[PDB]
């Protein structure tokens, strides 16, 4: 994670983040599956499947079978404010940057 100066910076100019989290590009509802040393996440739609293999210590924001809005974090850390474009929209990326960088 970053604070501070950096972070601001970091927002200002649309940086793709070190750590960053992992958002859902599709709603749906939560189907988790971990072996002992593999992890991934299951975005499960009425009809669409999404799948995202993310390393086995990353911390989860989702219970399992939660129905998750598209561009939702699944993953703890900063947002690509990119990936939050195409997955949710402007309006969502405008909110995202102005309450992040008021949070410094």
């Known amino acids: 994670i970053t604070q501070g100066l950096p972070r601001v910076i970091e927002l200002f100019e649309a940086r793709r983040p070190k750590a960053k989290a992992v958002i859902s590009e599709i709603d749906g509802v939560v189907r988790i599956e971990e072996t ?3 992890l991934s996440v299951f975005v499960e739609s009425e009809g ?4 995202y293999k993310l390393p086995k210590e990353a911390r989860l924001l989702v219970k399992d079978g939660d129905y998750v809005e598209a561009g939702q974090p699944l993953t703890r850390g900063a947002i ?9 929209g402007p309006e969502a990326v ?5 309450e992040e960088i008021q949070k410094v």
């Open 36 to 38: 002992e040393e593999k």
């Open 48 to 51: 669409f499947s999404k799948e």
């Open 80 to 88: 690509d404010p990119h990936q939050l474009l195409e997955a949710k």
């Open 94 to 98: 405008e909110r995202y940057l102005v």
